Design a protein around this ligand. Structure first.
Ligand SMILES: Nc1ncnc2c1ncn2[C@@H]1O[C@H](COP(=O)(O)OP(=O)(O)NP(=O)(O)O)[C@@H](O)[C@H]1O
Ligand SMILES: [Mg+2]
Length: 545
């Protein structure tokens, strides 16, 4: 949601009185402070502190460049950085921010109109921009909301269908009277004054005009007072709440960073009749490897379908069976054939010809650990957090599908691109028979469960957060087993935020029953991730180009 949602002292959209109340009840001490959302400005806040037993409310606007600042004060990249700053320097206020009035018990910020407005746009943005639906849309959103908002805040209004770049009041008027004179028909036209446009809309068969003024901060204003960062937000806002408007806005009067939804993010089946076994004649295989591992080798190739030719990855040699146990293998495959989720390497089908081949979705970016080695200066942490979050989305999926992985590890997290990771080889592990990814009970009692995987995710997090470093480097066999029992876990990676190491730690509880399940893991990894996805950027083609 809000880039202040993680802040333990942020209360969301509470009133000025509610605010004072929480402070009153906290000790009215000098330095007591809380943060909240400005009911009148989109993306803005209000710093509320106590000094000499009296309340002080400072509004915090969001400049057109993304920083936050109290009028006359310094600019800050975010609520977090702002509060961290004034805590060590009054720089204008009655006194430094000292004891924070953290939210009581288990209360969360009070979601308001801007939070609701924000989701709606993102939602209708992906649905719109990539015609996605169902969980697929839900999966796109949950993971890319951070990136989608940025897009929404940079999309030019000149783009929107309701904007008319060269219209006069008289014309717009006759353009609105020219057709379906329905309540809510509207358009926007820029007025002469720099940063001024007019909202022209129909109500009761009559056209109404509303000046839209732009202030010094650039924020767009409605006669009523509410401010927005762009017209589009203002428009969607008036679409729900119609303050100052004679009627809610309705129908319109018409006239770099690779995201995850390009290429097969969605299942290959978008009109089916898919069988488990494929025809070797529909499969084109190369004799050139993409690497190999414990099981067979991986070769690239293409697969032709009734209407499409897709690119695949063939893991030649699954292993092959010697007895009527080729049925058991086929049992698993049957199940895997069902698993469908963007963050997982889907199984297209199996084919038995010169060998027992496993055909999967193409994920050519390579393993997560190879992609991160030596790139600590290239790939920002927020970017790694994003991948670890995608990794838990597939894991939470696989867990609710009662399908244990058994081999979660970096080597098994495959990248489609910089911001798209897929989990692979989920199942082939249990086909036959450096492996410090297993939980203690996997080695101690042959026990495998989603809880067992949550441990491997813990290890994977480490592998990634420490940019491709081998787990428990100075060890191998039992040395680890021992190391574990003695209550020792791996150290917190350099430049790895506390919340992650905290999550990672909970992932390494010896009693699997105490370890979080992926549902909880995924919630936590998201909150962490979202908050990290604010601090601008670092390295490569990020001129926001
Ligand atoms: N679906 C795929 N698309 C593209 N490359 C793949 C795919 N699956 C595997 N690879 C490549 O093969 C390598 C991984 O080898 P693989 O045979 O999958 O096992 P591994 O991760 O080395 N170990 P393990 O699964 O534990 O036996 C990676 O470096 C990938 O580049
Ligand atoms: Mg693998």
């Amino acid at each position: 949601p809000d880039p202040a949602a993680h802040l333990p002292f942020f209360y969301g959209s509470i009133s000025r009185a509610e605010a004072e109340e929480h402070l009153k009840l906290a000790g009215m001490a000098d330095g007591l402070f809380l943060l909240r959302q400005c009911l009148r400005s989109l993306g803005g806040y209000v710093l509320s502190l106590v000094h000499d037993v009296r309340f002080h409310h400072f509004p915090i606007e969001r400049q057109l460049n993304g920083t936050y600042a109290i009028a006359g004060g310094k600019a800050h990249c975010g609520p977090a950085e702002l509060c961290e700053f004034y805590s060590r320097d009054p720089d204008g206020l009655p006194c430094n921010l000292r004891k924070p009035c953290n939210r009581p018990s288990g209360l969360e910020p009070q979601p308001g109109v801007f939070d609701c407005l924000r989701d709606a746009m993102v939602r209708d943005y992906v649905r719109q921009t990539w015609k996605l639906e169902g969980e697929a849309l839900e999966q796109a959103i949950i993971s890319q909301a951070p990136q989608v908002e940025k897009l929404i805040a940079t999309t030019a209004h000149e783009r929107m269908p309701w904007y008319h770049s060269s219209l006069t009041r008289e014309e717009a008027e006759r353009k609105l009277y020219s057709g379906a004179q329905t309540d809510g028909k509207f358009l926007l036209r820029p007025r002469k004054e720099q940063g001024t446009y007019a909202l022209s809309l129909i109500y009761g068969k009559t056209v109404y005009h509303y000046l839209i003024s732009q202030d010094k901060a650039g924020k767009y204003c409605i006669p009523e007072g509410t401010k927005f960062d762009t017209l589009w937000q203002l428009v969607e806002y008036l679409k729900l709440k119609a303050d100052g408007l004679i009627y809610c806005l309705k129908e319109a009067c018409p006239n770099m960073d690779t995201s995850v939804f390009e290429s097969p993010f969605s299942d290959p089946e978008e009109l089916k009749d898919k069988k488990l076994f494929l025809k070797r004649d529909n499969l084109l295989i190369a004799d050139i490897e993409l690497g190999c591992g414990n099981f067979g080798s991986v070769r690239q190739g293409v697969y032709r379908m009734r209407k499409k030719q897709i690119d695949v990855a063939i893991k030649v040699l699954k292993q092959g069976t010697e007895k009527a146990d080729t049925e058991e293998m086929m049992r698993e495959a049957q199940i895997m054939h069902q698993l469908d989720n963007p963050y997982i390497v889907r199984l297209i089908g199996v084919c038995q010809a010169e060998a027992l081949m496993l055909v999967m979705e193409m994920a050519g970016g390579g393993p997560l650990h190879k992609f991160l080695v030596g790139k600590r200066e290239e790939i920002p942490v927020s970017n790694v957090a994003e991948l670890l979050h995608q990794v838990s989305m597939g894991m939470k999926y696989l867990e609710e599908k009662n399908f244990v992985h058994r081999n979660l590890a970096a080597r098994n997290v495959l990248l489609v691109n910089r911001h798209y990771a897929k989990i692979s080889d989920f199942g082939l592990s249990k086909a036959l028979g450096p492996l410090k990814w297993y939980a203690p009970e996997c080695i101690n009692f042959r026990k495998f469960s989603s809880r067992s995987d949550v441990w491997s995710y813990g290890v994977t997090m480490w592998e990634a957060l420490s940019y491709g470093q081998k787990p428990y480097k100075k060890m191998k066999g039992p040395e680890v087993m021992a190391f574990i029992e003695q209550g020792k876990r791996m150290e917190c990676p350099p430049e790895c935020p506390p919340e992650l190491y905290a999550l990672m730690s909970d992932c390494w509880i010896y009693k699997w029953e105490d370890r979080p399940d992926f549902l909880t893991v995924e919630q936590r990894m998201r909150a962490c991730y979202y908050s990290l996805a604010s601090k601008v950027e670092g390295g490569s083609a990020l001129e926001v180009a």
